[PDB]
């Protein structure tokens, strides 16, 4: 007989997982200007959607960690910004945009030769809980750039990890059966419907 | 018997509304209704719901079917909040196995449900409170839940007996509020 | 105030729990209203009956709903085997359709008691008897009804009861269940000759799991 | 007369010893892809087997420290991962394997220009104790790689040290007499059996 | 809160004891059942008698079991020396076969009292006497039985006792034990003319060790 | 006398089982038995052990040998849990010096043991509790311990006396449980 | 071995000179 503390809701959703990956190449066309906007979503971790869609309503806080390095994995002398844009505010559209110097958007200046940064974001919904199903969930945005006027001398990659804390859930649902097709859409391929599990030749044979 | 959804009674036009009768056939797949959309053009409740800006209510649902002792089959009646699909006459299911939403039917008993076995009983009663993330909402822009009546065991009979079995739904609002 | 730094100093452990700097001080979240149906443990969902797909033979799209029941006919003799399945919620097979199997697919170890319910959905004028047997771990499938009788079993009557329940004493991270014909399927004139049985499975209050895993 | 606290079981097994050595060459065929899987065993320290086989059952926790450098002994700007795979989970088989981004496998991101990392592993047996003899002991796995998509620019060596804590033991046995031949096998060379100690010419001469 | 860093800051000392970050929070180990025979100190094992290989002369594989006993024959005269060995558990020689010697090969210093037991395994009708002597550190081996008598000794009778015990007063991180013939080996007609003696050695309750070492 | 292994009595088919007699010779090397494998095809205990999924028991062991007053020798009887080697008739030792496992025989007195000196006594009794890392186990897949009877001093006699000495083993289960 | 699984007794010449065995019931049968 094991313990019942392994199946609480704060153990099911309890670890930091990779939810984002921002690429800042020295050349090419991915992010030609040394900045990028990433919208906060929890389905960046591939296993999170089926886990959270077991319930209709959820309520939690989040903790974010930023790990940055060169594509090889090297550590270089660079400074970055990591701005947070709350839901309802304009987002940057250039390196000279005035949104980078708005005091109501919190920022975290940090070096690459530093331990990864870490911040906490509260529950930001206008309602009492988030809902993954609405018959009839904006959290914010993280903007990443390199501090300075000229372009950076190194190629950089930024990885974002999220951990959910103080979790509450209501009204369980059946777990997902079929492959997903879209985001924020329960649509499924109607020409190829598969059974829940595996089959056997006859009902009287093991 | 009577089941109370999630162990909660409704709390803070209140009459019986009997809908049109469905015909259960040998090849039926299932039906569903959406609330409050099922009652938005019928009577005083429907007049109240299209002229007020905020709405809040619970419900009491009765499902009935009369058949003889030489018929057989079984139905599952369940209530699913925020039933997103991937009037007063309802809709039919295209792929009942996935509940038309990509989720298995075999786990639908995780919701407030009842069984109608033609050899045992012919009635099912479910009491549903108000469920939302908001104290009030709009009766014309949001459907709070859906009602499902799906045959798990097919209807069977011998030739010469009646080939269609009627299913009747009668429902009453409970603790309805308007503003 | 002298201090020293230890070998685990500037490291980021993903399972580490601590406290961080709030990005937005002076912000107050929306207060929580009461919503019915709050879940605090997954064992509550593990203890709910769901349909067991004993008849996981067909695979066509249009025949997918036939996996939810298995037949009982009047063309079968007495003492003949009807169906057989194992008692392994976390393994591939019939138990994959239940919520207990799906939930224990997110862990590594489990142990406890189970229960299976069989419901008969024939006509009111049909009668008969069945034998439901359970074989402990390590034993083989019984060769006939007489051998299955010498063991854990139950005799089920369609006329008297519509549902029966069987308890599996203990399983671990096994046994077999077999259904035999005791009598023949008796039916008057004017009633259908075939019926179906629906099986539902759940867990008892001593079931537990451990060591979460991603599926 | 000395003290009896020097012979307790927490003094016999009380120090951190080298149990592993992972090589990540820039060229060759040892670990061509910049990763390696190391299975947690305590007999990597050459003197541990005869010491622990003095008893039949043991129960303890472990503490692991990772020291990394260049074959010369230099310190370079690199980032590593150090993933822990619990008993019962799939292990990585490539640098692009999805196992590196599974949240249920704990990870420790760290720099080479940092103090050595350090974590604790609990008692993980399904039984009440480990046993070195079974007439008729998986702890996990540590996966080591270099963070990034491209290959590293330096050759690296990683050394792992283990210390056992909270030690308990039952049912002592005779100490090993002969040379070992296999792992998890009491087999011995039957054609060359040697005495326990040294010999002398006659029984009446010192 | 001002702070300063000291010269031993980012160092890894292998004998350092502290606390680390648990890799798996929320994991509960299996509870401990009761198992008989738990050991908490190594002195308990040091205080158990084990066979002493006084006769470590032969080396062949097939003659390896002859090292566990030494003979007493009827062809030896009175006053003749039988065997001699030292009292050094941690040194190379006879004491290597005992568990005390193997255990004190894992340390650097030790001191205390010892005890040796001699057991006679001849026939029931054999009789005789022996003299067992102990010589303190620094002294030489006695030249004859008469010299050995003037000292610490004991007279052992086969007919009266089967086992005898001798205590060594003190050893350090030395003395000698010698066995002499007092009388001849007396035996009736029909009994074997040769017998064997088995020696067992242990430690007393005041034995201690210090400064662990790897062997 | 009677020795109790590790100072513990057995706790939570119970009769005497006398095995076949061994013959001690001048060139004997030693014998060993494994439990519960020694009692798995003999009587009700053997029938119970092959038809139950879990098992748990202690034991009481008597070793006897009758010889005259003109014989000599000495045997060591010991019990070693989890005796891994590198039926009811036992096995003989190939290299008794290393106990067939790479460990010295001179340290075998660290286990529950007794001495049989032909000039002093002719019996030895050992009481063994249940030892495992699990409350229950399988009687057909795991041997809990082994019993060793090894001559440390060789058997000797004069010509005309009996050249073989019998050794008899009789044992009784204590507090046996099945499930 | 078969005789051991049943009513029996083990007799020692050295320890005892005589032994006694009781036959539970006979009628107007068993074997020794």
Tab-separated table of N, CA, C and O in Angstrom, chain C residues 5-15 108-109 210-214, chain D residues 86-89 102-104 106-110 114-119:
chain	number	residue	atom	x	y	z
C	5	UNK	N	30.205	29.013	-0.029
C	5	UNK	CA	29.351	28.501	-1.088
C	5	UNK	C	29.641	27.026	-1.326
C	5	UNK	O	30.799	26.604	-1.338
C	6	UNK	N	28.583	26.254	-1.517
C	6	UNK	CA	28.594	24.802	-1.568
C	6	UNK	C	28.509	24.296	-3.003
C	6	UNK	O	28.152	25.044	-3.916
C	7	UNK	N	28.846	23.024	-3.243
C	7	UNK	CA	28.950	22.533	-4.629
C	7	UNK	C	27.661	22.549	-5.449
C	7	UNK	O	27.736	22.302	-6.656
C	8	UNK	N	26.502	22.834	-4.868
C	8	UNK	CA	25.300	22.907	-5.679
C	8	UNK	C	24.772	24.314	-5.878
C	8	UNK	O	23.563	24.539	-5.796
C	9	UNK	N	25.658	25.271	-6.154
C	9	UNK	CA	25.310	26.679	-5.960
C	9	UNK	C	24.509	27.267	-7.122
C	9	UNK	O	23.340	27.624	-6.959
C	10	UNK	N	25.114	27.387	-8.297
C	10	UNK	CA	24.429	28.031	-9.421
C	10	UNK	C	23.771	27.015	-10.343
C	10	UNK	O	23.938	27.073	-11.557
C	11	UNK	N	22.988	26.092	-9.802
C	11	UNK	CA	22.401	25.024	-10.592
C	11	UNK	C	20.892	25.199	-10.665
C	11	UNK	O	20.268	25.739	-9.749
C	12	UNK	N	20.313	24.751	-11.773
C	12	UNK	CA	18.871	24.815	-11.996
C	12	UNK	C	18.338	23.388	-12.060
C	12	UNK	O	18.504	22.697	-13.067
C	13	UNK	N	17.692	22.954	-10.984
C	13	UNK	CA	17.038	21.656	-10.915
C	13	UNK	C	15.549	21.842	-11.174
C	13	UNK	O	14.893	22.633	-10.493
C	14	UNK	N	15.019	21.120	-12.163
C	14	UNK	CA	13.646	21.361	-12.591
C	14	UNK	C	12.616	20.912	-11.563
C	14	UNK	O	11.499	21.436	-11.560
C	15	UNK	N	12.953	19.964	-10.697
C	15	UNK	CA	12.044	19.533	-9.646
C	15	UNK	C	12.214	20.324	-8.357
C	15	UNK	O	11.539	20.024	-7.371
C	108	UNK	N	3.671	4.419	-12.455
C	108	UNK	CA	4.546	3.265	-12.629
C	108	UNK	C	4.133	2.056	-11.809
C	108	UNK	O	4.272	0.928	-12.281
C	109	UNK	N	3.631	2.253	-10.592
C	109	UNK	CA	3.246	1.153	-9.721
C	109	UNK	C	1.868	1.405	-9.134
C	109	UNK	O	1.484	2.547	-8.879
C	210	UNK	N	1.872	5.234	-7.587
C	210	UNK	CA	3.120	5.868	-7.179
C	210	UNK	C	4.049	6.048	-8.379
C	210	UNK	O	3.971	5.301	-9.354
C	211	UNK	N	4.935	7.047	-8.279
C	211	UNK	CA	5.991	7.340	-9.260
C	211	UNK	C	5.417	7.729	-10.627
C	211	UNK	O	5.487	6.986	-11.607
C	212	UNK	N	4.829	8.925	-10.647
C	212	UNK	CA	4.285	9.522	-11.863
C	212	UNK	C	5.226	9.380	-13.054
C	212	UNK	O	6.448	9.479	-12.922
C	213	UNK	N	4.632	9.163	-14.227
C	213	UNK	CA	5.341	8.979	-15.485
C	213	UNK	C	4.525	9.616	-16.599
C	213	UNK	O	3.306	9.745	-16.499
C	214	UNK	N	5.201	10.012	-17.671
C	214	UNK	CA	4.547	10.637	-18.814
C	214	UNK	C	4.298	9.596	-19.894
C	214	UNK	O	5.204	8.841	-20.258
D	86	UNK	N	14.279	7.560	-13.893
D	86	UNK	CA	13.915	6.645	-12.808
D	86	UNK	C	13.745	5.228	-13.322
D	86	UNK	O	13.575	5.016	-14.530
D	87	UNK	N	13.802	4.225	-12.444
D	87	UNK	CA	13.631	2.834	-12.893
D	87	UNK	C	12.225	2.599	-13.427
D	87	UNK	O	11.236	2.788	-12.718
D	88	UNK	N	12.143	2.176	-14.685
D	88	UNK	CA	10.870	1.944	-15.346
D	88	UNK	C	10.561	2.888	-16.490
D	88	UNK	O	9.481	2.771	-17.084
D	89	UNK	N	11.450	3.816	-16.840
D	89	UNK	CA	11.208	4.783	-17.894
D	89	UNK	C	12.186	4.588	-19.051
D	89	UNK	O	13.303	4.105	-18.850
D	102	UNK	N	11.199	15.237	-21.308
D	102	UNK	CA	10.123	14.654	-20.519
D	102	UNK	C	10.221	15.222	-19.111
D	102	UNK	O	11.263	15.104	-18.463
D	103	UNK	N	9.141	15.851	-18.648
D	103	UNK	CA	9.195	16.581	-17.389
D	103	UNK	C	9.303	15.664	-16.183
D	103	UNK	O	9.708	16.125	-15.111
D	104	UNK	N	8.959	14.388	-16.322
D	104	UNK	CA	9.043	13.466	-15.199
D	104	UNK	C	10.443	12.905	-14.998
D	104	UNK	O	10.662	12.169	-14.033
D	106	UNK	N	13.899	14.244	-13.914
D	106	UNK	CA	14.537	15.466	-13.412
D	106	UNK	C	15.862	15.757	-14.101
D	106	UNK	O	16.620	14.852	-14.448
D	107	UNK	N	16.145	17.048	-14.274
D	107	UNK	CA	17.334	17.525	-14.966
D	107	UNK	C	18.004	18.617	-14.145
D	107	UNK	O	17.360	19.269	-13.323
D	108	UNK	N	19.306	18.805	-14.366
D	108	UNK	CA	20.101	19.823	-13.673
D	108	UNK	C	20.961	20.539	-14.708
D	108	UNK	O	22.038	20.056	-15.063
D	109	UNK	N	20.520	21.708	-15.160
D	109	UNK	CA	21.322	22.516	-16.070
D	109	UNK	C	22.382	23.287	-15.292
D	109	UNK	O	22.078	23.921	-14.279
D	110	UNK	N	23.628	23.236	-15.767
D	110	UNK	CA	24.761	23.801	-15.042
D	110	UNK	C	25.867	24.165	-16.025
D	110	UNK	O	25.901	23.689	-17.158
D	114	UNK	N	31.446	26.506	-12.822
D	114	UNK	CA	30.558	26.524	-11.672
D	114	UNK	C	31.059	25.489	-10.682
D	114	UNK	O	31.778	24.560	-11.065
D	115	UNK	N	30.704	25.617	-9.406
D	115	UNK	CA	30.999	24.544	-8.467
D	115	UNK	C	30.296	23.270	-8.889
D	115	UNK	O	29.240	23.314	-9.547
D	116	UNK	N	30.857	22.109	-8.555
D	116	UNK	CA	30.242	20.846	-8.975
D	116	UNK	C	28.806	20.721	-8.486
D	116	UNK	O	28.471	21.138	-7.377
D	117	UNK	N	27.954	20.152	-9.334
D	117	UNK	CA	26.557	19.955	-8.983
D	117	UNK	C	26.415	18.842	-7.950
D	117	UNK	O	27.314	18.029	-7.752
D	118	UNK	N	25.261	18.810	-7.286
D	118	UNK	CA	25.046	17.870	-6.193
D	118	UNK	C	23.555	17.644	-5.995
D	118	UNK	O	22.806	18.606	-5.818
D	119	UNK	N	23.129	16.378	-6.019
D	119	UNK	CA	21.733	16.002	-5.815
D	119	UNK	C	21.665	14.786	-4.898
D	119	UNK	O	22.655	14.094	-4.670
